[PDB]
Amino acid sequence: PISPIETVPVKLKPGMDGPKVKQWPLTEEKIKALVEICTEMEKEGKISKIGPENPYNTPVFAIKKKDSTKWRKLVDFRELNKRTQDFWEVQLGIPHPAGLKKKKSVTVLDVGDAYFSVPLDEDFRKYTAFTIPSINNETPGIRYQYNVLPQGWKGSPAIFQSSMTKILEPFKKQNPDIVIYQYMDDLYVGSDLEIGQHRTKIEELRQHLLRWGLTTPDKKHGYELHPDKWTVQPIVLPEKDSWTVNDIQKLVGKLNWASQIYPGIKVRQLSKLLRGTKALTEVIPLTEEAELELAENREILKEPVHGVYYDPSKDLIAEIQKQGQGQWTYQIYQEPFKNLKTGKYARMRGAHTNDVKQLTEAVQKITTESIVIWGKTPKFKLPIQKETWETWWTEYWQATWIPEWEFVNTPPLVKLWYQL
Amino acid sequence: PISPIETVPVKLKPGMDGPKVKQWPLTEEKIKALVEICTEMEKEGKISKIGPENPYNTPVFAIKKKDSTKWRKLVDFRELNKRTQDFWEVQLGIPHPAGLKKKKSVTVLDVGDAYFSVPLDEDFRKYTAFTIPSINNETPGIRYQYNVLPQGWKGSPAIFQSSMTKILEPFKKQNPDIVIYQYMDDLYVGSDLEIGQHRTKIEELRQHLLRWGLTTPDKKHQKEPPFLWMGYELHPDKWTVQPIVLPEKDSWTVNDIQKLVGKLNWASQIYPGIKVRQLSKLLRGTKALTEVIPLTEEAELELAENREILKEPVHGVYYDPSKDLIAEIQKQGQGQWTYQIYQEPFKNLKTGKYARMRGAHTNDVKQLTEAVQKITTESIVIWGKTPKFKLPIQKETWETWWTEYWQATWIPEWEFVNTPPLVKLWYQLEKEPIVGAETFYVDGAANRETKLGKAGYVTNKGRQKVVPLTNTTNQKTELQAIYLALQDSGLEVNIVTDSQYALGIIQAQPDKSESELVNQIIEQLIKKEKVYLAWVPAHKGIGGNEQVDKLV
Ligand SMILES: COc1ccc2ccccc2c1/C=N/NC(=O)c1ccc(O)c(O)c1
Ligand SMILES: OC[C@H]1O[C@@](CO)(O[C@H]2O[C@H](CO)[C@@H](O)[C@H](O)[C@H]2O)[C@@H](O)[C@@H]1O
Ligand SMILES: OC[C@H]1O[C@@](CO)(O[C@H]2O[C@H](CO)[C@@H](O)[C@H](O)[C@H]2O)[C@@H](O)[C@@H]1O
Ligand SMILES: OC[C@H]1O[C@H](O)[C@H](O)[C@@H](O)[C@@H]1O
Ligand SMILES: OC[C@H]1O[C@H](O)[C@H](O)[C@@H](O)[C@@H]1O
Ligand SMILES: OC[C@H]1O[C@H](O)[C@H](O)[C@@H](O)[C@@H]1O
Ligand SMILES: [Mg+2]
């Protein structure tokens, strides 16, 4: 009937129970797709229907690949994760190569399918249960639980880690300068070849993987990334010629908030021109003892933070601020005012690009950056409405994972971050 | 009776055992009804006398109804549930009527001893164990155990609804033309066919149901057109709120208002424009349950109107799939917006209200945004898709606000609706200073203790004023200054504040506040032609701010 079924038995550590998360209400569109998908998986054996004797449930969504033709199921295993973590991060964890962020090109390719060939630990399948919603609560939702390593679960990879690296065993010896970090379903290939060749070694691997185990990756004659290029650090102060009282004030404050990070930021002889109750539209030519601070400080602001070191026990925070015009800035950090990275996202080739869409991309962007630089996904403090977000993101969202997010209503630094 | 369904494997939380509670040997006017009943169930299989074993017991009280034949044995499993494993929590939601697709002539079914017709886990039966005392006060008690769902054992609405479904599953397939809705022991088989042929089907599901152990009533199939449902009144081509009792008293309490307002919230679904802001503004004196709460002059005026609204019955329509959904809003002020989702003129599926989020500083556009939202999230439930919006604002007014709002908003797809009031931002701040306009350097502090402050200013032209304040907060003197500058200043002005707060509140362009102070400021903004507000860090040597920063 069946062969030697050896599955890695999984456990949640003592004190935590399977996930019990409410299934979100989806558009009749997404349901129907989610309906066919499982209908087929159930048929494939990948999943099975369950009863009321499984109190467990994780949210499941539906999103387009890039193929606004066909949908793909995206289960939000954010909870089942934290409750298995001691397993996918302790026991069978996957080390993160610090060089990956150095190579000139990193192509990220999907390996999620290599997972539906590995049976899930009997006594654990019960925690991977999900419900396919019903319009207007008409009928009761549909109940399924997995039978194979499900994508999205941070264990699917940790379990596959062996079969995987074993497949990479011939390719890695032969191409010993290429980095290959497996983060969940995604596989990151990093190297330093021509942007032409780098698309060939990939293909080699692509082909290698395709044969060896039919670990079918979804390529598309396939996601180029350039780690090195990411180096956006200055915080330019407008350095004009004509300054009004008003512009000096805007500068001091914008210069004072500043010092909350950089230690040697000295705003004194600047308050020198701000002396006297003057009109705001009054040009005051910069003094002689004055522009010291202009550039003497612009310097401490030319060379970045000294004493900012990542911590693996504390998690990562990512803040994004709408900057206007498809302009979105952001900072990654841990101890308020001690950034690990800062940058900008941009709307460039889309006349249908709206806030939400941007944010959803600006986020996935920031998430991959971390996944690369740190091997871990940050927690976002999204400047959007909790209700609106929880409705639309799965629209333009098209990643295989979901980070932690919360919602904020920003203290208007005049975003002492923008340059223009 | 005894359904040939397969059973749902049940257990108890890890490390627990059956409840071994005992029977307060009670009567015989009842240690009789029990033996009569049990034995009658025992025949029907619902139960089976259990051996001289280890089984734990459960209390089996009895009570009597008021129509007359006899008593009800009511076992109290409270201690069995506590030990019973959790279950996939059934539909916690209720299928709102405005979204059941219209049909020609619907039916309804009332499953019988539902719970008692579904077999119980052949292994979790031993924990249902109980006993009724002897007919005499002596004690050779009678032992039984359940073979079907217990009547309120924890897992019952679950394992029932479960099994139900897996039965209707095969029926619905051989009949892809009938939408049977399920809720408790209620089936909503309905379709649009000659009325005669249709019955041939209902009298068919019924055969199939009874075929497998589930029983259903029958005038032939029992209910006429006016159906009741969790508070609804579903006609064959219309739905409506069941009747509402909006009382008149000479005394109300914190318990009398939740009832009122609670009754008022429900009626809004279809009753257009049920204002209930001031009435709920009351439930927060303190949360004592019984309290002589004096009606307010505003509530009694609000309730008087709510009554006049209810003094006239309104209907609700059914959902038509091919036709789409349209939703339109309208602001009643005070942050009270009302809407209505429809497909056709004079035919709403439902209307509702959108309260003000009970906050402190929000402008119409914000609210209208959150309004659209509430309606969006909701339309995706009752219907499954979002509606075309008809919002009382012009694409021009919106475009402005979002492209200038630090937050990422997303009003989806609307059309203009010219019917006042029309949502609009009343005052606007100069993005840059104003040259030939006096610059007021304001600031005003207060003693956190003595609760005494003074707001004031000092300008370029050399004018100064300090107005003494009393029983004020610090933020009060902070805004007291901006308001003071707006007073003393001319037609266009530039203000410099050390107040993060003051600024933000105004730079929020939040119209419609309660706080007299804000509205005065907001009012004074309106009157001004051009205003530019500036923020500088206080206590930082501004040879121009370290003035009022020291004068106050
Ligand atoms: C327990 O229920 C009642 C007791 C007494 C009544 C007296 C007069 C009218 C309706 C009544 C009702 C309710 N009758 N309700 C139904 O037969 C019904 C059928 C299909 C559905 O989908 C649904 O949601 C409710
Ligand atoms: O979108 C937030 C919302 O998502 C829920 C599921 O309905 O939970 C998930 O997302 C959270 C985001 O911070 C995670 O922290 C949580 O672990 C995950 O299951 C809700 O709980 C939450 O309100
Ligand atoms: O059909 C839109 C049109 O209907 C109007 C006036 O005829 O209002 C009536 O019809 C609406 C249809 O949805 C009802 O909601 C409304 O209560 C009723 O008075 C206008 O709203 C609009 O121009
Ligand atoms: O135009 C769409 C693409 O724009 C940018 O590259 C985004 O970072 C990426 O997430 C998105 O796929
Ligand atoms: O909800 C009350 C329930 O009482 C009992 O369990 C009955 O068997 C069932 O008909 C009903 O569903
Ligand atoms: O919202 C309050 C109302 O909810 C439902 O209609 C209940 O059946 C009714 O008892 C209650 O008055
Ligand atoms: Mg001050």
From Swiss-Prot, chain B:
What is known to happen upon mutating W398L? No effect on RT p66/p51 heterodimerization
Site feature (Essential for RT p66/p51 heterodimerization) residues: W401, W414
Q: What is known of its domains?
A: RT is structured in five subdomains: finger, palm, thumb, connection and RNase H. Within the palm subdomain, the 'primer grip' region is thought to be involved in the positioning of the primer terminus for accommodating the incoming nucleotide. The RNase H domain stabilizes the association of RT with primer-template. The tryptophan repeat motif is involved in RT p66/p51 dimerization.
Q: What is the effect of changing D185N?
A: Strongly decreased RNA-directed and DNA-directed DNA polymerase activities. No effect on RNase H activity
- Effect in UniProt of substituting E529Q: In strain: Isolate PV22
Portion of the parent chain present: 600 to 1151 of 1447
Domain RNase H type-1, by residue range, is 434-552
Q: Where is this region: RT 'primer grip'?
A: 227-235
Q: Where does Mg(2+) 1 bind?
A: D110, D185, D186
Q: Which domain of life is it from?
A: Viruses
Q: Where Mg(2+) 2 is bound, by residue?
A: D443, E478, D498, D549
In the record, what lineage is assigned to the organism producing the protein?
Viruses, Riboviria, Pararnavirae, Artverviricota, Revtraviricetes
Instruction: Explain what the record says happens when changing V189A.
Output: 37% increase of DNA-directed DNA polymerase activity. No loss of RNA-directed DNA polymerase activity
The consequence of D185E is: Strongly decreased RNA-directed and DNA-directed DNA polymerase activities. No effect on RNase H activity
- Give, from the UniProt record, the effect of changing W229A: Complete loss of RNA-dependent DNA polymerase activity. No effect on RNA 5'-end and 3'-end cleavages
Site, Cleavage: residue positions: F440, Y441
Q: What is the effect of changing Y183F?
A: 70% loss of polymerase activity. No loss of polymerase activity
Q: What is the effect of changing W414L?
A: Almost complete loss of RT p66/p51 heterodimerization
Q: What is the effect of changing D186A?
A: Strongly decreased RNA-directed and DNA-directed DNA polymerase activities. Loss of pyrophosphorolysis (reverse of the polymerase reaction). No effect on RNase H activity
Q: What is the effect of changing V442G?
A: Almost complete loss of virion production
The record lists the effect of I167T as: 34% increase of DNA-directed DNA polymerase activity. 18% increase of RNA-directed DNA polymerase activity
Q: What is this protein called?
A: Reverse transcriptase/ribonuclease H
Q: Where in the cell is it found?
A: Virion
> Mutating P55G: what's the consequence?
64% loss of polymerase activity. 57% loss of RNase H activity
